[PDB]
């Protein structure tokens, strides 16, 4: 189990980063002047996700376990 890793759960980070844009989603609803109480269930979200690695990330003494230098980062937008 050498590898150290940390991550949110996918759906939880999704709903938080989505509710954060509630300001701009409601302001777009008012700008287009669409109905508010009506047409609540017809939304559609398009999400770009990316993955990438990274070289020569130095490591530290710590207490273990031993770990490689390369790090990998998975992120979405």
């Amino acid at each position: 189990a050498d590898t150290i890793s940390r991550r949110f759960r996918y759906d939880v980070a999704l709903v938080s980063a989505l509710k954060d844009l509630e300001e701009d989603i409601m302001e777009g609803l008012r700008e287009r002047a669409l109905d508010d109480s009506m047409c609540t269930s017809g939304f559609t979200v398009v999400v770009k996700e990316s993955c990438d690695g990274m070289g020569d990330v130095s490591e530290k003494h710590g207490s273990g376990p031993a770990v490689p230098e390369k790090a990998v980062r998975f992120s979405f937008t």
């Binding site: 979200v45 398009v46 996700e49 690695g53």
Partner: protein, 155 residues
């Protein structure tokens, strides 16, 4: 709706089982080899996706026709591993710009000297042509030489 597009070619080929990257099969979207893509450059159609790659790994593994290795590789068109993740069939911008910039940098280097008259030069003349190219680019375009072609030097 999810669209995985932020991968470089190394990782696009790893996550879809294709072999990488100086392979005979160059295109992640099309099935042409190196020869048929140097012959006809500008006519092709996108075929590759996730589901067909899964099915082609199945064909390569069950091998229902008892074909030899070298010809089963051509029948399955480069699928030697099982796809792990679905990525939309798209091109990456930044590494494409970088690839084309390194290609023109190599073309210019060939051009400084005469490469199409004397087809077999040595390493000495190659280093000399690169050196005079970098000196001339630094004198006018204001570009120090690079270890590896980053995006800004490519713009």
């Amino acid at each position: 709706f999810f669209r995985g597009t932020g991968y470089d070619e190394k990782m696009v080929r790893e996550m879809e089982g294709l072999e990488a990257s100086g392979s005979t099969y160059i295109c992640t979207l099309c099935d042409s080899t190196r020869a048929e893509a140097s012959q006809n450059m500008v006519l092709h159609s996108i075929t590759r996706s996730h589901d067909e790659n899964l099915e082609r790994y199945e064909i390569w593994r069950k091998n229902p026709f008892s074909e030899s290795a070298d010809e089963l590789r051509d029948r399955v068109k480069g699928v030697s591993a099982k796809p792990f993740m679905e990525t939309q069939p798209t091109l990456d911008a930044l590494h494409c710009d970088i690839g084309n910039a390194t290609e023109f940098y190599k073309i210019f280097q060939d051009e400084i000297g005469e490469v199409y008259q004397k087809p077999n030069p040595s390493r000495e003349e190659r280093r000399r042509w690169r050196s005079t190219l970098d000196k001339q680019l630094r004198k006018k375009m204001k570009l120090k030489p690079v270890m590896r072609m980053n995006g800004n030097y490519a713009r």
